[PDB]
């Protein structure tokens, strides 16, 4: 649909992303000097229409409270309808953190950069949690760089050229699934690899599910790959038990997902083929650390706290923002 013109000013010039909802495109703005903006064009389908209308209402609230994007939510500039598609116009951001890592060969981010990004992500989502909202769909595809310009240098260690961001500042996008405390809470939220155990076990969720997703994001930034290479719920749980230890009994007792459990234990055979796969690919969390220096132990301390099983016990973002891991930023 490149060449189409929306609202008589925004001409499509490229596709930035795609999703359940539709697509995000880059447009030239013919009424503002040809400067470029992003536009989310939503499918003409009820569920996605209603999510976009929700998104707009959230964005108007967040933009009114924080018009300068101090807390780094993406800025909506305007919204309109076009051939029954709701279109939301945004400031143009650069690549998602996912796309940057992909294009860099799945090399992980440097720790100094991870520190800055984690801080900004926590600061943004916390702003949300302070406003009775939960995002519910945090993942690297929904954390975008403000500018994804990079310098390149030969890295002798790994015998290859690598890209380093000039500026690693980010913003959080996609408020289509965002849910106020008092609204209906969907049964299933999040993209599988970022999904908290309370969601898998259908216990109910709130702000702490976002904290779990952030835990998973930070691991991926650190390693360049997921520690939950799965598309199956019961196996995901097996993976969690290998990385983090057994699930709390009280959560197993509460759940109605009885098919995952035998007696009051995860119904998992470590000697099955799936069992080998899990044992090969997943190991205790701190065994993933690439170094033992204190900066690393502290990242991993934080991550472990974010990946607390019990959402009542899990670290809050308010508490995360004061974590020792973040001092070299002050
Ligand atoms: N709200 C929302 N939901 C999903 C994706 C985007 C989005 C993807 N790529 C972008 C580039 C610039 C501004 C926004 C986006 N935004």
Curated annotation (Swiss-Prot):
Binding-site positions, ATP: 16-24, 40
Active site: 137 (proton acceptor)
Keywords attached to this entry: ATP-binding, Kinase, Nucleotide-binding, Nucleus, Phosphoprotein, Serine/threonine-protein kinase, Transferase, Tyrosine-protein kinase
GO-annotated biological processes: regulation of RNA splicing
Reaction equation(s) it catalyzes: L-seryl-[protein] + ATP = O-phospho-L-seryl-[protein] + ADP + H(+); L-threonyl-[protein] + ATP = O-phospho-L-threonyl-[protein] + ADP + H(+); L-tyrosyl-[protein] + ATP = O-phospho-L-tyrosyl-[protein] + ADP + H(+)
MF (Gene Ontology): ATP binding; non-membrane spanning protein tyrosine kinase activity; protein serine kinase activity; protein serine/threonine kinase activity; protein serine/threonine/tyrosine kinase activity; protein tyrosine kinase activity
Tissues expressed in: Endothelial cells.
Disulfide bonding pattern of the chain: none
Keyword Zinc: no
Domain of life: Eukaryota
Gene Ontology CC annotation, any one: nucleus
Biological role stated in the UniProt entry: Dual specificity kinase acting on both serine/threonine and tyrosine-containing substrates. Phosphorylates serine- and arginine-rich (SR) proteins of the spliceosomal complex and may be a constituent of a network of regulatory mechanisms that enable SR proteins to control RNA splicing. Phosphorylates: SRSF1, SRSF3 and PTPN1. Regulates the alternative splicing of tissue factor (F3) pre-mRNA in endothelial cells.
Protein name as annotated: Dual specificity protein kinase CLK1
Enzyme class per UniProt: transferase
EC number(s) on file: 2.7.12.1
Domain Protein kinase residue range list: 10-326
Residues of the full protein shown: 152 to 481 of 484
Self-association state and partner proteins as the record states: Interacts with PPIG and UBL5.
Gene giving rise to this polypeptide: CLK1
UniProt activity-regulation remark: Regulates splicing of its own pre-mRNA according to its kinase activity; increased expression of the catalytically active form influences splicing to generate the catalytically inactive splicing variant lacking the kinase domain. Leucettine L41 inhibits its kinase activity and affects the regulation of alternative splicing mediated by phosphorylation of SR proteins.
Compartments reported by the entry: Nucleus
Post-translational modifications: Autophosphorylates on all three types of residues.
Family classification: Belongs to the protein kinase superfamily. CMGC Ser/Thr protein kinase family. Lammer subfamily.
UniProt keyword Magnesium, yes or no: no
């Amino acid at each position: 649909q490149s060449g189409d013109v929306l609202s008589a000013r925004y001409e499509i010039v490229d596709t930035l992303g795609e999703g359940a909802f539709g697509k995000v495109v880059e447009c030239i703005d013919h009424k503002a000097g040809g400067r470029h903006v992003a536009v989310k064009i939503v499918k003409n389908v009820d569920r996605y229409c209603e999510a976009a209308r929700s998104e707009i209402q959230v964005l108007e609230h967040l933009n009114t409270t924080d018009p300068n994007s101090t807390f780094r939510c993406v800025q909506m500039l305007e919204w309109f309808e076009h051939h029954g598609h709701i279109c939301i116009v945004f400031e143009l951001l650069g690549l998602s953190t996912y796309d940057f890592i992909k294009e860099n060969g799945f090399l992980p981010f440097r720790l100094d950069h991870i520190r800055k990004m984690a801080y900004q992500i926590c600061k943004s989502v916390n702003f949300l949690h302070s406003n009775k909202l939960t995002h519910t769909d945090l993942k690297p595809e929904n954390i975008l760089f403000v500018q994804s310009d990079y310098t390149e240098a030969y890295n002798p260690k790994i015998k290859r050229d690598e890209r380093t961001l000039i500026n690693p500042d980010i913003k959080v996008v996609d408020f289509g699934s965002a849910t106020y405390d008092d609204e209906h809470h969907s049964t299933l939220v999040s993209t599988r690899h970022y999904r908290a155990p309370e969601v898998i076990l259908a216990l109910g969720w709130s702000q702490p599910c976002d904290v779990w997703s952030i835990g998973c994001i930070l691991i991926e930034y650190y390693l360049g790959f997921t520690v939950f290479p799965t598309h199956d719920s019961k196996e995901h749980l097996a993976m969690m038990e290998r990385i983090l230890g057994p699930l709390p009994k009280h959560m197993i007792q509460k759940t109605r997902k009885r098919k995952y459990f035998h007696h009051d234990r995860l119904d998992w055979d470590e000697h099955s083929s799936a069992g080998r796969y899990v044992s090969r690919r997943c190991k205790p969390l701190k065994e993933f650390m690439l170094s033992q220096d204190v900066e690393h132990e502290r990242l991993f301390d934080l991550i472990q706290k974010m990946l607390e099983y019990d959402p009542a016990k899990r670290i809050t973002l308010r508490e995360a923002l004061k974590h020792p891991f973040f001092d070299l930023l002050k």
